[PDB]
Amino acid sequence: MERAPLLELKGIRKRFGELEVLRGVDLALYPGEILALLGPSGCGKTTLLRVVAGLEVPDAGRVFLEGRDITALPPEKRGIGFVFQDYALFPHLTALGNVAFGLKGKDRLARARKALERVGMTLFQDRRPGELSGGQQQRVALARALAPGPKLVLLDEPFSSLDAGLRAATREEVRKVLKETGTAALLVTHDQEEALSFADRLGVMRGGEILQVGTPEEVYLRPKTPFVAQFLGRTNLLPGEGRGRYAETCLGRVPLAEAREGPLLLSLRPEALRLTPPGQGPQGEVVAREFKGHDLTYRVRLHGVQPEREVLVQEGPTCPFKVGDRVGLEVVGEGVALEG
């Protein structure tokens, strides 16, 4: 939230013997900022978290925390909280001793109780991890990580193990705890709603290299690779040719983001298309019609295109269209020319 980088990586590289999992990661984090790392589950995000936490030694690059180099410090001298997938709860301690583990004031217990109260657990503060549920274990792990009062917390897929219904509430509670305490977070996640709502910024990794970092809206509007485009939301990938400010695709003449020439791949979101009564322009048939409340998501199979081609169209709730009707496609939004 400041103009000075809290966490800053500079050319981080790492080889697992011969396989390079990181290939020059550069990344800057800021106070009170939640940044979520995204990728094709093989880009080395957990490796990045381990390198930042000190649990792994990079083969090159620098790590800066609060303006001072910490790349050579052991994990215990850094002051970076960590939340693991399995919560790494110590089984011989009740869920107050776990929280007091980090506290070096002869294991202060009042502060452990306050930290447990923040995550809303006081009735079960004397229960061992064997007799705790998944959400309760998650809250205990978060309280343990945040009890020593760090300025940076790494979270390795925290809510991925919870139930489907509990995630939406646990995510909001953890976010409000983090924002009221005032600690930056570095999150590794494989979720769309978590990346859209929980995170303040997004960072996308291809093969251990950061390729796109920005606000979730900026990443949604201006993607770079098809994986990012589908990850942020459903989209239409269209082969095409660009000759200027526009491009020629199977749907006709589609506006381009800024400019590109030659053969290319295009991302055109469903909200960038409109359905019209059958007239001129591209024609198609409605194959499906999803009802989502505030909007409808039609699917249209095109006609003039020799190969089979289906496009998604976003429409308002008052659309008087039905499955099997003939439609014409109108392009209102702007496409994004993906690099590949």
Partner: protein
């Protein structure tokens, strides 16, 4: 070198003769009799153990039973009674002049009864774990497809029970193969009894070595068969949620009775018989009871300490740094535990005579052999304690502000030392009531409680042997109960 060197010379010693001598030893009619007797006893004991263990596991797992933990503890308790103690109780409580008005059964039937009663809890525990480790949704899905509960059990539950059946059957068969006290006291002619007779009575060390080689061949074949069957039907929990247990109704008093016949036969009745026999205990023999107890303690303490001291590095290397050395060491420990104790002691005797003659007839050799024999017994709890604390927990402690030494001493040590204590107690009680290895490896004139019981029962002095067996059973039962309670706590 725990078993690689000892049992190596066991085959070398046997293969030291004229080529016609080996043919003559192989071509003896007694070998077929020994094989038939051993296999028949193993099959009968397996059948009896199955008949006792399967219904008990079902009742204590899949039935609204009052106090399942209490019944499980009562059924596991017969593990504390040694085989020779049960054989002595059977001999003293039957026949002419016995406590009960019954004749002494044949050698086969008494041995079968005692061995089944003392070996069924292994199968019982395995079947209970298998029953607890199934997903009730699987049986529910089988039942929604049109299968009544009995056909569900036949076609769904039993295939998942099969690995537990194989494990329990292997344990029981190994115990029957390696058993010496029960068959010797009841004069049943298995391989172990024949080996003891040839080594001690007939003074036929070469033929004893050949019989030991036959016994290790059977043990290896059984292990290979179990491994092949396990790999055939490996099958690869489902949160193990609770399902509505089957109601009993008017069968509640009956089932309890079925859950009481084993414990009464293997624990309560032996205690009553020993207390009835010890009333006529001669005061002249009091001096030999204290000496026997002291000798048993003096052997069992260093054995427990050495067993723990060898189990801790093995388990730590197996967990933290898994390498080929870890599997080799674990397999060596398992083989040391699984080789029949009498053939194991003969291999140790032959090795010590060949290589290290100054160790033969000493307490050091006996202590080392017993420490290697009880390596798995101690290694169990240490394995559990180290599996409950992965190194990722040490990493988590390191992120919180702990150096590697403090991360070890605040996360791993509090469970490691408790596991070490449990393993030490297990090895202690194991070495307190070891008949074969102690009988065959102890110095001349050195006798522990088990050897006194065996010697007194061999000359039919039941009242004299009563206090020794009382001590053995009391300490064994107390330790088993304490360890079971501690495990339930953990």
């Amino acid at each position: 070198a725990g078993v690689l060197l000892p049992v190596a010379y066991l085959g070398v010693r046997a293969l030291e003769a004229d080529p016609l001598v080996l043919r003559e030893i192989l071509l003896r009619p007694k070998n077929l009799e020994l094989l038939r007797n051993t296999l028949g006893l193993a099959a009968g004991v397996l059948g009896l153990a199955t008949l006792v263990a399967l219904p008990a596991a079902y009742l204590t797992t899949r039935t609204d039973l009052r106090g399942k933990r209490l019944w499980a503890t009562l059924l596991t308790l017969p593990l504390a009674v040694p085989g020779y103690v049960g054989a002595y109780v059977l001999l003293s409580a039957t026949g002419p002049g016995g406590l009960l008005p019954l004749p002494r059964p044949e050698g086969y039937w008494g041995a079968l009864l005692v061995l089944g009663l003392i070996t069924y809890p292994y199968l019982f525990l395995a079947l209970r774990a298998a029953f607890l480790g199934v997903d009730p949704s699987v049986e529910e899905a089988a039942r929604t497809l049109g299968h009544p509960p009995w056909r569900v059990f036949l076609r769904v539950t039993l295939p998942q029970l099969l690995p537990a059946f194989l494990s329990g059957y292997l344990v029981i068969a190994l115990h029957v193969l390696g058993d010496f006290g029960t068959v010797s006291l009841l004069r049943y002619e298995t391989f172990s009894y024949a080996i003891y007779l040839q080594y001690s009575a007939a003074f036929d060390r070469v033929y004893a070595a050949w019989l030991a080689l036959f016994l290790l061949l059977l043990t290896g074949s059984l292990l290979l068969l179990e491994a092949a069957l396990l790999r055939r039907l490996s099958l690869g929990r489902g949160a193990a949620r609770t399902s509505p247990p089957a109601r009993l109704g008017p069968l509640a008093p009956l089932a309890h009775l079925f859950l009481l016949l084993p414990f009464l036969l293997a624990v309560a009745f032996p205690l009553y018989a020993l207390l009835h026999l010890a009333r006529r205990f001669p005061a002249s023999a009091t001096s030999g009871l204290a000496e026997a107890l002291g000798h048993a303690l003096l052997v069992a303490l260093p054995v427990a300490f050495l067993s723990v001291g060898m189990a801790l590095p093995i388990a730590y290397l197996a967990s933290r740094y898994p390498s080929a050395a870890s599997r080799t060491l674990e397999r060596l420990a398992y083989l040391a535990y699984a080789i029949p104790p009498l053939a194991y002691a003969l291999a140790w005797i032959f090795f010590s005579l060949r290589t290290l003659p100054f160790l033969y007839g000493t307490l050091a050799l006996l202590v080392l052999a017993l420490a290697l024999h009880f390596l798995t017994e101690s290694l169990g709890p240490v394995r559990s304690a180290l599996a409950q604390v992965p190194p990722r927990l040490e990493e988590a402690a390191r992120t919180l502000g702990d150096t590697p030494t403090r991360a070890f001493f605040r996360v791993t040590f509090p469970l490691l030392w408790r596991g070490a204590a449990a393993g030490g107690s297990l090895a202690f009680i194991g070495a307190m009531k070891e008949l074969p290895i102690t009988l065959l490896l102890a110095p001349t004139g050195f006798s522990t409680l088990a050897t006194r019981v065996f010697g007194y029962t061999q000359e039919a002095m039941f009242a004299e042997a009563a206090p020794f067996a009382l001590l053995i059973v009391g300490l064994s039962a107390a330790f088993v109960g304490v360890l079971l309670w501690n495990e339930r706590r953990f």
